[PDB]
Amino acid sequence: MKTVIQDTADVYFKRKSDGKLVFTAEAQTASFSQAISEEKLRGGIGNKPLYILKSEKEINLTVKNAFFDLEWLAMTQGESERYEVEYRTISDIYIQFPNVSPSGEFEMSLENGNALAPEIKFEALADTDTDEMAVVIEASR
Partner 1 sequence: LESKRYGEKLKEVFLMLDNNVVECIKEITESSRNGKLVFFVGAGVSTLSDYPQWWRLVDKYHEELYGSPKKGNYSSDEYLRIPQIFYNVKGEMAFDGILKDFFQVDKPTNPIHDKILAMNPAHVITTNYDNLIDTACWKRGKYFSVISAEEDVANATSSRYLLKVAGDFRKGFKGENVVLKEDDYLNYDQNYPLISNLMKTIIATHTIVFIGYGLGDYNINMLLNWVRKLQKDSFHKPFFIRTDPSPIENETLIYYENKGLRIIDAASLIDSNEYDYLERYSAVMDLLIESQENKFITKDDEVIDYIYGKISPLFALQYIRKIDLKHVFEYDYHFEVNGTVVRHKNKGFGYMERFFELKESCDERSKLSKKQYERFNALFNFFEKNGVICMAKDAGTLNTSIEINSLAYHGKYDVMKKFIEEQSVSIEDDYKKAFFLACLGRWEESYDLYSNIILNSIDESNGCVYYLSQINRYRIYQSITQAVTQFNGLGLLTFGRHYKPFTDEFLARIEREMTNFNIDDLFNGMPFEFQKKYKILEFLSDNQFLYDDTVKLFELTNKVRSEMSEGSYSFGMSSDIVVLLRLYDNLRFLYENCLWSVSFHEFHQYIRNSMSLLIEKAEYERTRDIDELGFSFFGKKSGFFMEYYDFVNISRHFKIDDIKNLERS
| Per CB under 8 A, 65 contacts partner 1 | yes
Q: Which is nearer to partner 1, 42 or 96 (CB)?
A: 96
Strand partners, 105: none
Q: Which of 14, 25, 27, 98 binds partner 1 (CB under 8 A)?
A: 27
**Residue 51 beta carbon to partner 1: minimum distance, rounded to whole angstroms:** 21
How many Cα atoms sit within 13 Å of 21 on the Cβ side?
13
Nearest CA-CA partner of 66 in 18, 121, 19? 121
Q: Which is nearer to partner 1, 2 or 48 (CB)?
A: 2
Taking residue 59's Cβ as centre, other Cβ atoms within 10 Å add up to: 19
Q: Which is nearer to partner 1, 4 or 45 (CB)?
A: 4
Q: Which is nearer to partner 1, 48 or 141 (CB)?
A: 141
Range list of H helices, 24-67: none
| Per CB under 8 A, 53 contacts partner 1 | no
* DSSP assigned state of 84: E
| Per CB under 8 A, 131 contacts partner 1 | no
Taking residue 38's Cβ as centre, other Cβ atoms within 10 Å add up to: 6
| Per CB under 8 A, 31 contacts partner 1 | yes
Nearest CA-CA partner of 18 in 96, 87, 81? 81
Residues at the interface with partner 1 (CB under 8 A): 1-9, 22, 26-34, 57, 60, 65, 68, 73, 76-77, 79-81, 83, 89, 93, 102-115, 117, 120, 134, 136
